[PDB]
């Protein structure tokens, strides 16, 4: 059949929002999360009806199966039941009655994190080691938000990572292989836990202080998994302090249990962030 | 006929499986043992799927057969029963109460079961698995998928092999099959030696941190997998062996079988 819907099996919630206000535009993201397109949607925010407020639409690619559907439905329904949360791209509506399926959440204006840090580079808006340490604690608080709803990440880094207007770090793939990224316990027998998102996470804060750099760069693949064996951790960024880049091997513990769970890093972050 | 079995026993419980294979599905059979009066066993059916086609319905028709007459060997998933005239088609095959392979080995590894994995059981269970993999090779089997999951563990911690057919696991897939889209039992030997890998590591991931875009080519290049920490210097090379770039080189199951009661029988 197709996602049209002849004789598929569709709900009525409150979420619906009204096919006939939506517009799309150009595909935004190389589409590992789906088919993802800009949209000038009207009247989302249900407090400011007739200004025209851009989101993304989450749609089927062309050659989708039934279970592509399913997945995108279900998805539909994780991001309902997940709740609201500043740090991450957030559900607010849908398209599912009398036509195709349209996911809308949240736009971002400014690219993902690894271009956005890159083009504030010093070689406009310089960022400084306060707004490195702000946006850090920005995710973390996100991270761990997205802990509580026993959520797995499909693929965390800077390019998975949004920007607003605002300048408010959002957190997107909380649902190709990103093996600079995983940890050893992931790569060997490709299970992800929290622990592991805990060491992507240190990952993640080591792209930021870099300034959108490329982790173990010049390490092939092949070995890189032998080398973490070993204990061997990417060293400090340049314009860093010895306790994050304490807190980022203690990310990247050998072993999970000792790791620092979520809200230990937002503790500390909000520690370090006190102190401007 | 003979191997026919009565309807009022059989039960749906839980699918069992994720796929592959069949629509394999929970049982509890009673008194399907001959020397056993009543005592209910736990079985798998495999049952038809909902959207029940042409070629589906001769497909595990064809399966019933190929159980037929393979015959009977303890390390593989025999066939004991079936539910097919008058009726819905029920196949009920054996039950493995521990699970797969791949997840028995992970819960059983040193820091889910206290009873940690000797080097002897490991090397019992590549003993077993081959001497399995020279049964299926006796008569013209195919194995479709050979992988940790697609072997079972009964509670008596038997090996027993759940995928095999008659005349993409990329990571499993020998060079041959891979760039030149041939099959023989060469390449059964490869995914053989893979499936070592993965024992010898307790249920590891084969090629840990490569992707298969960059595993292709370096495939292609020679590179072969690092020698599992469990493992030792000779079972390595009879991995290493199994991989060998010539397939013609590589042992045969009959080999694999003697050379790995030949280290069995040490220390015992
Ligand atoms: C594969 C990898 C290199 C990559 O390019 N990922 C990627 C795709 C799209 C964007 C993106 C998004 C965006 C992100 C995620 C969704 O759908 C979604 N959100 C949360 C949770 C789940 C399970 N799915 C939709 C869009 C946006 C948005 N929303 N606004 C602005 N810019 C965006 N980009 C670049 C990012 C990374
Ligand atoms: C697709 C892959 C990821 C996977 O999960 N395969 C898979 C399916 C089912 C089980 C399984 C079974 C089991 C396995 C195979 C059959 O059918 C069959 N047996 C022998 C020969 C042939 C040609 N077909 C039926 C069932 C069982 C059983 N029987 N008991 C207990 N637990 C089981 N599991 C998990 C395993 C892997």
């Not at 329904?77 to 609201?84: N, P, T």
Request: proline letters at 6%; one cysteine or more; charged letters at 30%.
């Amino acid at each position: 059949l197709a996602g049209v819907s002849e004789y598929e099996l569709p709900e009525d919630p409150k979420w619906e929002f009204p096919r006939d206000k939506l517009t799309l535009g150009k595909p935004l993201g190389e589409g590992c999360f789906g088919q993802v397109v800009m949209a000038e949607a009207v009247g989302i925010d249900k407090d400011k009806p007739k200004e025209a407020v851009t989101v993304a639409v989450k749609m089927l690619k062309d050659d989708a199966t039934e279970k592509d559907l399913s997945d995108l439905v279900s998805e539909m329904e994780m991001m309902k039941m997940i709740g609201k949360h500043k740090n991450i791209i957030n559900l607010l509506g849908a398209c599912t009655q009398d036509g195709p399926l349209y996911v809308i959440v949240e736009y971002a204006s400014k690219g993902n994190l690894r271009e956005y840090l890159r083009a504030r580079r010093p070689p406009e808006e310089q960022m400084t080691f306060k707004d490195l340490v702000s946006c850090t604690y920005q995710l973390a608080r996100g991270m761990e938000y997205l802990a509580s709803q026993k959520c797995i990440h499909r693929d965390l880094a800077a390019r998975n990572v949004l920007v607003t207007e605002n300048n408010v770090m959002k957190i997107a793939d909380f649902g190709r292989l990103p093996v600079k990224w995983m940890a050893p316990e992931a790569l060997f027998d490709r299970v992800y836990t929290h622990q592991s998102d805990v060491w992507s996470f240190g990952v993640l804060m080591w792209e930021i202080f870099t300034l959108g750099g490329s982790p173990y760069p010049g390490i092939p693949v092949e070995e890189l998994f032998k080398l973490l064996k070993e204990g061997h951790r990417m060293d400090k960024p340049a314009n860093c302090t010895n306790e994050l880049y304490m807190m980022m091997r203690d990310c990247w513990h050998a072993v999970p249990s000792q790791r620092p769970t979520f809200k230990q890093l937002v503790e500390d972050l909000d520690r370090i962030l006190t102190l401007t």
